[PDB]
Design an enzyme around this catalytic site. Sequence first.
Site, PDB file in Angstrom:
ATOM      1  N   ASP A 290     -11.855  -4.860  18.508  1.00  0.00           N
ATOM      2  CA  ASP A 290     -11.469  -3.646  17.782  1.00  0.00           C
ATOM      3  C   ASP A 290     -11.895  -2.413  18.597  1.00  0.00           C
ATOM      4  OD1 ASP A 290     -10.687  -2.128  15.347  1.00  0.00           O
ATOM      5  OD2 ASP A 290     -12.807  -1.622  15.229  1.00  0.00           O
ATOM      6  N   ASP A 292     -12.564   1.469  18.660  1.00  0.00           N
ATOM      7  CA  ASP A 292     -12.755   2.689  17.869  1.00  0.00           C
ATOM      8  C   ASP A 292     -13.010   3.886  18.763  1.00  0.00           C
ATOM      9  OD1 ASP A 292     -12.401   0.809  15.928  1.00  0.00           O
ATOM     10  OD2 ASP A 292     -14.258   1.132  14.814  1.00  0.00           O
ATOM     11  N   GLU A 294     -12.943   7.490  19.163  1.00  0.00           N
ATOM     12  CA  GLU A 294     -12.920   8.696  18.358  1.00  0.00           C
ATOM     13  C   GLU A 294     -13.137   9.887  19.288  1.00  0.00           C
ATOM     14  OE1 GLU A 294     -15.092   8.747  14.248  1.00  0.00           O
ATOM     15  OE2 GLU A 294     -15.109   6.596  14.707  1.00  0.00           O
ATOM     16  N   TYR A 370     -10.859   8.535   5.532  1.00  0.00           N
ATOM     17  CA  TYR A 370     -12.066   9.075   4.881  1.00  0.00           C
ATOM     18  C   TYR A 370     -12.591  10.111   5.813  1.00  0.00           C
ATOM     19  CZ  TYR A 370     -13.306   4.959   7.526  1.00  0.00           C
ATOM     20  OH  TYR A 370     -13.388   3.992   8.479  1.00  0.00           O
TER      21      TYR A 370
END
Length: 567
Positions: A290, A292, A294, A370
Site C-alpha cells: 500500500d 501512502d 501524502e 477524513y
Amino acid sequence: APTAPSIDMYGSNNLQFSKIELAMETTSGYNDMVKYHELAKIKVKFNQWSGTSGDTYNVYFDGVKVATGAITGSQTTASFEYGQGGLYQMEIEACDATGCSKSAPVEITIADTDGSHLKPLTMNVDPNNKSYNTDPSIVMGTYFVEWGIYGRDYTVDNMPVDNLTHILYGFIPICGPNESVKSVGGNSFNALQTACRGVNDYEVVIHDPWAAYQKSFPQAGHEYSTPIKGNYAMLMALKQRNPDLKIIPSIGGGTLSDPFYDFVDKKNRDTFVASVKKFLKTWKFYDGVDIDWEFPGGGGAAADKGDPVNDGPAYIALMRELRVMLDELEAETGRTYELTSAIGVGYDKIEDVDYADAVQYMDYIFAMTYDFYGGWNNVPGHQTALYCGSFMRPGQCDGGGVDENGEPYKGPAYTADNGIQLLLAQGVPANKLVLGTAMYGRGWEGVTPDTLTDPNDPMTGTATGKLKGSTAQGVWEDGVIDYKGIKSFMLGANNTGINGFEYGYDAQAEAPWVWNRSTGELITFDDHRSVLAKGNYAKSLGLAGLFSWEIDADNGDILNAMHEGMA
Ligand SMILES: S=C=Nc1ccc2oc(C3=NCCN3)cc2c1
Ligand SMILES: S=C=Nc1ccc2oc(C3=NCCN3)cc2c1
C-alpha cells in the site's frame, strides 16, 4: 550397537531454528538486523555419554533423511541446512559397522515468515465487536498502527479480525530525506536514522524493530528462544487463523512521505521497487503493498516539496513498476499480490494525478475521506462529512462562489462526496474505490456562543486553538481524540452528552459533533449514524467497500456501524 544420541536441547538453541535471522537485543541498521536465508542453518548438539559413540550420524525429520556427518566423540554438533519452515519430528541416529541406534523423536521448529511454524493466534477482542455475515466480496479495511502497542496498549490479538478483509499495517518508512519526521519530535526521526544506517537511500525499512519483531508477547506464547516475536509474529499467527485475511504494509503516510518526492528520478523508483520486492520475500505473511504518498504535487507535511507537473506522472510510473514487480512475485510463489494506495481527496490533491491512468495497475484506492478540517487552524468544519454542511457559504459546496473577502472559491469544498465524484469523473471505476471512515475526532478549544454566526451551529464559530486533553481521555496529540475517548468522556452511554458536552448532528452533511458551550471544546467525528450514511452511499454507487483509520481508537461501534451500513 552405538549408544542412541540424546539431544542437548539447551545447547541446540532449544531446537528453535529460522529461515530469518533477527537481532533481538540490539537496535541498529536494517541490513544489520534482518537477514533472510533461502535455507535455515540448523545446529544440533547431541551427547552419547556411555558406551560406544559409533562413526556416523544421520538426521531425520518426519522419517526423511536430511543430514549425515561424522561422529568423532562423546559430544557431536550436527550442522546443516534446510529449506522448509514448519514443525518436524526430529530423530538422530548414530551408526557403526554393526548397526544404528535412533534417538527418541523430538519436535524441531523451523520458523518462516509465512507463519508455517505457528498455531492460529488466540484472540482477545472486546466483545462489543459483533458478528456479521457481510458479503465476502465487500472490502472492510482498517489500519493497525505499529506504535499502538505502547501507551494505547492495543495489540494484534485485540483486532476484530472476523469483521475485516484487509489490515493495513502502518507504517513502513523509506530511507533518505525525512525532515518532516524530524518536525514531529520524540525518538521517531532518531529511530529512522538508526534503521537507515548502512542502508541505501530510497529503500524501505522497519521503523520500530522492537514493536515489529523483538517484543515478546505472552498472549502469543513467545518465550526467550522464539525466533520471531513482536507484531509480525502475531500477524503471522493471525494469517494461520484467517488465511483469507489480506495483510498489507503501508509505506509512507503523513510524516513519512518526504522521499516520494524524489521519485521523479527513475533510479530512486527502481531502488525502492527492488527493496519492496526483497521486503515481501523477507516477510512472507504480507499480501501486497500500500502506497501512502501524502501527496503528489505537494500540500503535505513537507512545505518545501511537491511538483504538480511531475509528481502525478511519477506516481503512475511508480504504480506500473510496482505492479510489474508484483507480477514476478506472483510468478515465483503462486500467490495473489495486491497493490493499493491511500490518497487525498481534496480537489487540489486529486487534480494533480491522473488516477484513472494509475488505477489500472491497482486493486484499490483508499479514499482518505477524513481530515477535511482539524486543529491546524481556527476554522471549524466537519472533518469527515459525506455532503456539504449547513455552515457552508452559498457557492462554497461546488466552488462556484466567493468567501467573506469576496475572494473566489478555488474548487469544490472538502467533503467525501465531492472527492468520490471527482475521482469518478476522471474515470476511476466505482468498484475500485474504498470510502474512508474516521475512528477519531478532530477538535478545537474556544468556539463559544459569542463566535457563532448561527446560534445553533457551532460549525459557524471561530476557534482559539486545538483541543487539549490527556491520554486518559484518548487525546494522544493536540486536536485529536480516539473515538472510544469521545464515547466514554463526551457522549456517555446514551449518546445524549456528558461532562458539559452536547451531541449535535448536521443532517445535511451527515456529520455528528459534540460541543461544550463553556470551554468552547468542539469535536467533529464519525458515529453510528454517519457511518450508516457512508455505507448507504457506498452501496448506492457500487464502491468497493469501506475502510477506517485507525483500529485501536474504536470500541467496536465504528466497525459495527461499518458492517450494518453495508447490509
Ligand atoms: S500527519 C501530518 N500532516 C500534515 C502536517 C503538516 C502539514 O502542512 C500542510 C500544509 N498545507 C498547506 C501548506 N502546508 C499539510 C500538512 C499535513
Ligand atoms: S494529525 C494531523 N494531520 C494533518 C492533516 C492535514 C493538515 O493540513 C494542515 C494545514 N496547515 C495549513 C493549512 N493546512 C495541517 C494538517 C495536519
